[PDB]
């Protein structure tokens, strides 16, 4: 940056803009943090529901293998073929696409859900509900993580502005001010010396 008055004014404008940008990003981060701490409560509820559903479904399965022979129940359970029910649509949260698992998961898709065991059909119902709870937990956690990453980005930007950019502009301002003041001092000294020489000439020779 060349030391000139207009460059000094430009640097000062950059300083003011950087400070205002720090304030703006701080407000953005406050909004993000509020949303994040709401999402944390949502995630807590979702995980509690998942725990309840897991307990119920596992209890159903255990009693499925208790009233019926474990081998027969296990064979029946493994006889159900795998299937796809999830749709991996995307939702735009804070300018960032995030997956949303809008799964249909039809009940009629399953094959051989019941057989010789009596309760095994009910067990499949509990595990289907547990899969639904798992998908809910996924939907909550993914967007929570995205909000967290956005907060990290904003904090990195704010810290960069406050620890690198602004000190640099301040240093440049100081340097240009010193250069300009030195030039002014030199000009004044030259004028004074020339004026004194002229006065001496007038006194000596008029």
């Amino acid at each position: 940056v060349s030391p000139t008055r207009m460059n000094l004014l430009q640097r000062r404008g950059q300083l003011r803009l950087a400070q205002k940008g720090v304030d703006l990003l701080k407000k953005k981060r406050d909004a993000l943090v509020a949303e994040f701490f709401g999402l944390v409560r949502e995630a807590m509820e979702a995980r509690k529901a998942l725990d309840q559903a897991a307990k119920e479904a596992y209890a159903a399965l255990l009693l499925a293998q208790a009233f019926d022979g474990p081998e027969v129940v296990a064979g029946a359970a493994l006889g159900v073929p795998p299937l796809e029910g999830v749709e991996a649509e995307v939702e735009n949260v804070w300018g960032s696409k995030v997956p949303r698992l809008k799964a249909t998961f039809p009940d009629g898709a399953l094959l051989s859900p019941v057989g010789t065991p009596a309760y095994t059909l009910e067990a499949s119902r509990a595990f289907r509900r547990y899969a639904e709870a798992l998908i809910r937990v996924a939907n909550t956690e993914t967007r929570l993580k995205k909000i967290g990453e956005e907060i990290k980005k904003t904090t990195r930007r704010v810290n960069a502005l406050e620890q690198v950019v602004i000190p640099g502009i301040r240093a440049q301002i100081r340097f240009i001010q010193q250069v300009l003041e030195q030039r002014e001092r030199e000009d004044t000294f030259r004028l004074k010396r020339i004026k004194g020489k002229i006065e001496a000439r007038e006194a000596e020779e008029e």
Partner: protein, 104 residues
């Protein structure tokens, strides 16, 4: 959507029509997770917390460019009937997300 967990819950998940597999050891769990994640079409690959706590920490190298398959730690059956500190899990997740590690 797939689940790698203990066989008892894995077979129940299969009974729910979801792809699933058993697990025996942390290295085996990681190998199974890598095998699943390598192939496509799987949007959700759950994992037990007992054998592989942080699935992202394990298979980050694979999906960082193809993040469609979500990962989700799933409750351990051993702790299922004695309770687990969900609050602790979210404390760890908040620490992972914002770094401050502060809450009450």
């Amino acid at each position: 959507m797939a689940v790698i967990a203990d066989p008892e819950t894995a077979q129940g998940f299969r009974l729910a029509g979801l792809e699933g597999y058993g697990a025996s050891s942390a290295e085996e769990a990681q190998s199974l997770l890598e095998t699943l994640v390598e192939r496509g079409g799987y949007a959700l690959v759950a994992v037990d917390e007992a054998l592989l706590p942080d699935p992202e920490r394990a298979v980050e190298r694979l999906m960082r460019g193809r993040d469609l398959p979500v990962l989700l730690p799933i409750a351990g059956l051993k702790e299922a009937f004695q309770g687990h500190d969900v609050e602790g899990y979210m404390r760890e997740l908040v620490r992972k997300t914002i770094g401050f590690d502060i809450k009450l």
